[PDB]
Amino acid sequence: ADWEDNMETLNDNLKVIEKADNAAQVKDALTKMRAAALDAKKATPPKLEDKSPASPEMIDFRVGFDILLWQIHDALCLANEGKVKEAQAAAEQLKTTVNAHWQKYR
């Protein structure tokens, strides 16, 4: 998927986590978030289309998804251990990071 569609998937699944009732739903949403963050590493935001693919700006873009992926990892471990409330709080932090990346590159 292109970058904005992958960001939409991240946001849709943050809402699923915020409203979730059990650990299985949280786990499923986090797995979708991970797949979207990895796919977005292959994307180029429109404002960077005129940059080299390994320009410092595009490295910052890709490593920003690495930052999200490690936070997704913390939340997904918490969900897998049944720590649903901790996973949801972690998702609130994920929301902050996703928004910051959106604002930086759109």
Residues at the site binding Na ion, with contacts judged by CB under 5 A: 5
Q: 26 with 87: CB under 8 angstroms?
A: yes
- Quick note: the x/- pattern for a second copy over 71-100, rule CB under 8 A, is --x---x--xx-------------------
Q: Pick from 39, 77, 95, 97: which binds Cl ion (CB under 5 A)?
A: 77
Q: Please report how close the Cβ of residue 39 comes to a second copy at its closest, in angstroms.
A: 8
Nearest position to Bi ion, beta carbon: 77
Q: 18 with 88: CB under 8 angstroms?
A: yes
- The structure tokens listed for 85 are 């409330």
Q: Pick from 18, 47, 55, 59: which binds Cl ion (CB under 5 A)?
A: 59
Q: 26 with 79: CB under 8 angstroms?
A: yes
Q: Pick from 18, 19, 46, 52: which binds a second copy (CB under 8 A)?
A: 52
Alpha-carbon gap, residue 57 to 49, rounded angstroms: 11
Q: Please report how close the Cβ of residue 56 comes to a second copy at its closest, in angstroms.
A: 5
Contact flag: residue 80 with Bi ion (CB under 5 A): yes
Nearer to Na ion, 86 or 102 (CB): 102
For 6-42, b where at least 16 C-beta lie within 10 A, e where not — what string?
bbebbbebbebbeebeebebbbebbebbbebbebbbe
